[PDB]
């Protein structure tokens, strides 16, 4: 009986190593939205990764992210001298 329990536990373990979950239940999750509340009770919306939206104007200035590896932003004050 001990050997049977051991082999049954091993078999069950093998089953857990293939895939836990594989579906998303589109019935509600597909259209329903996600929201959470932090420790401070503040609300935030779940940002879903959508393809690039069509730009309707000249907004969305070029960012050049690869340049941000060493630079962050441009402050207002400067040295202000020749």
């Amino acid at each position: 009986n001990l050997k049977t329990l051991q082999e049954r536990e091993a078999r069950l373990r093998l089953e857990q190593e293939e895939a836990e979950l594989l579906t998303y239940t589109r019935e509600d999750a597909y259209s329903m939205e996600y929201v959470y509340e932090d420790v401070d009770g503040q609300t935030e919306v779940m940002p879903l990764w959508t393809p690039p939206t069509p730009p309707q104007d000249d907004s969305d200035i070029y960012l050049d992210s690869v340049m941000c590896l060493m630079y962050e932003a441009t402050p207002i004050p400067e040295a202000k001298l020749p």
Binding site: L21, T25, E27, P47, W49
Partner: peptide, 16 residues
């Protein structure tokens, strides 16, 4: 998730 009651861990919504 909605129908399940288990936390699947870290995840992010993405359109395919």
């Amino acid at each position: 998730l909605t129908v399940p009651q288990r936390c699947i861990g870290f995840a992010r919504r993405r359109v395919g």
